[PDB]
Amino acid sequence: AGINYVQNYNGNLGDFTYDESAGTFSMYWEDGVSSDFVVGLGWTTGSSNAITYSAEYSASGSSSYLAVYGWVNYPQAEYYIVEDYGDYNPCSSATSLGTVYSDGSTYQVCTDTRTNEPSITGTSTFTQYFSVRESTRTSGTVTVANHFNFWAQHGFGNSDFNYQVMAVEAWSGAGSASVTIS
Template identity: 45%
Template sequence: MSHVPPRGRLRALVAGLATAVLAAASIAWAGTAQAEADRTLTSNLTGYHNGYFFSYWKDSGNVTMRLGAGGSYSVQMSGINNFVGGKGWKPGSAHTVNYSGSFNPNGNGYLALYGWTTNPLIEYYVVEDFGSYNPSSGTTSLGSVTTDGSTYDLYRTQRVNQPSIIGTATFYQYWSVRRNHRTSGTITTANHFSAWARSGLTLGTHDYQIMATEGYQSNASSSITVSEGSGGGTTPTDPTTPSPGGCTATLSAGENWSDRYNLNVAVSGSNTWTVTMNVPSPQKISATWNTTASWDSSGQIMTARPNGNGNNFGVTIMKNGSTTWPSVSCSAS
């Protein structure tokens, strides 16, 4: 890790007028020393610049990353296999993050709040924009959270014997992928951390966290400025939010196949409940167990009630090209 070098100290006392002149010059110099000059990186490095942690990592190709004033940076890449870099904080936390700028993926690239934890080793992304490839492709949704003006779909993937902050390792990746793309705004990070936790995705001890530009076999470019936000951001809504009707329905993943998947529903707070499940089209529920179910005329909204088998039931959903989990609400009767 590279740190900002310590500034030199003034020499011993100088008598008379020379002392005053030297002191004045020192004050003027110190006043401008807070802003570091722009810095250009072309190889792997981490460190600090103008009060922000930065990270530059690539496995091959040509990437120029320019560190600018405050939390600003820009990236130009060509002929790369994989690159990720940006500015942020070390350690990361549930920051409210403001960012703005431009992001131009010519192929597969992400603009994301990106970070790592240890114990467990986790690589995580809050994806704000992406290019030709949706990082959730081929994975099973773990639900969604609505925050900061859009719904984010939640996913987990696994990397086996891949580069990490502790060397080659096997680890999970956690994802929140924004449905409405953007290149500026506010990320209420705590809402994503909480949504992951409700889906059973546990973070460890935070290492670094950056507003990152990533490219994979593409020629992406960006110019981004990141800063610490204030306040608590927006209040999230997600499939496990307690309902006002006196009970809560919580979804968890079951078995998954190429054409369908199972979801488990756990009801708490009442033994006389009614759960409403809204299944996004074109998905369809093909089977249920441990509940008495009925549907509206569209076939997308299911009403489930106890059938004597307790407060846990399940459904099988035909994907029909989509893996977005349904939303659920619960009321006690």
């Protein structure tokens, strides 16, 4: 996949292993976590190219996501295309933007504003964009373009991309995850 970036945000909170060249990574937090971590493999500059992945993901009792994750520099935005998740749906609370259909399923799409929080610039106010898969899965292709195009109708800059990775995130509870990016 031309993986050239390792995402490790508090990976030390659980057990994070990875092989850039194989496009694989695992992450165990079986003892539970009480703080947020985001780990994964990807690219230093994001693009609208499709991402194919395969995963073993077990996070039923955990506030966790198995998602395509990345940032946009300006307007600053953090984004997720959540394929599978734990006990928490971000669109349950956020402002609804509609629905989008892609790769065999509809995704609820929502947005939210984070004030003075950890960001690719340290601490700041940024916008989040979420596409949550209606029929969750742990393997398949994500045609990122379909999501970027829909979000772009609502403010998503759709250019000036920072990093983008296939990620696993959790900030409560315990779980397990093994992922391969093809």
